[PDB]
Each structure stands twice: as structure tokens, then as C-alpha cells.
């Protein structure tokens, strides 16, 4: 149900050191409207207050919906933004 704005990429890149670090090696990323999204489904052993409080360090949340940025976003990395971040980064 997580779904962060970000100002650039450059903040999810930022971010997938923290996520990977907390064990969170998946994320969606969304390119939309000029801007990037990530969206978390599994949230490893972590609350959502957890995992967002650390979204909030790197991005602000969105009112988009999955929906929104699924039929009208372009599909950047599906289920393994972090992994396939930090695996470059």
C-alpha cells in the first residue's frame, strides 16, 4: 500500500542502500508524470511505519494510486528495484 514520490532517481538509488540495508530488496519503481516512484509490497520483518519513515528520508508520499501508475506509468523495475540498484550502485 506504499507508493513515495521521489525528486529524481538519484534519491531511489539514495534509498536502496537504506532498503537494502533493512533487508527490503524489492521495490517497484514508476516513471510518471516526469517524476520516479517506488512502490513496496513486502516489507520483510518491518512495520509500515518502518519502512515509510525511511521512504520519507528520500522521497514525500504520492496520492497516486498502483492503478494510476500502473496502466499510465512506465514500468521501470518491477519487484526488484533495490536488488537491481544496489547490484550497479
Known amino acids: 500500500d506504499i507508493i ?3 525528486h529524481s532517481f538519484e534519491d531511489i538509488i ?3 542502500e ?6 527490503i530488496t524489492g521495490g517497484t519503481v514508476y516513471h510518471y508524470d ?4 517506488l512502490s513496496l509490497e513486502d516489507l520483510g520483518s518491518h512495520t ?3 519502512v515509510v519513515a525511511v521512504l520519507a528520508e528520500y522521497g514525500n508520499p504520492t496520492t497516486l494510486t498502483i492503478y494510476r501508475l500502473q496502466e499510465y506509468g512506465k ?3 518491477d ?3 533495490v536488488e537491481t540498484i544496489q547490484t550497479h550502485f
Open 4 to 6: 513515495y514520490q521521489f
Open 18 to 23: 537504506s532498503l537494502q540495508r533493512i533487508g
Open 34 to 37: 516526469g517524476q520516479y516512484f
Open 48 to 50: 509500515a511505519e518502518g
Open 14 to 16: 539514495q534509498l536502496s
Open 79 to 81: 519487484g526488484n528495484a
Open 75 to 77: 514500468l521501470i523495475m
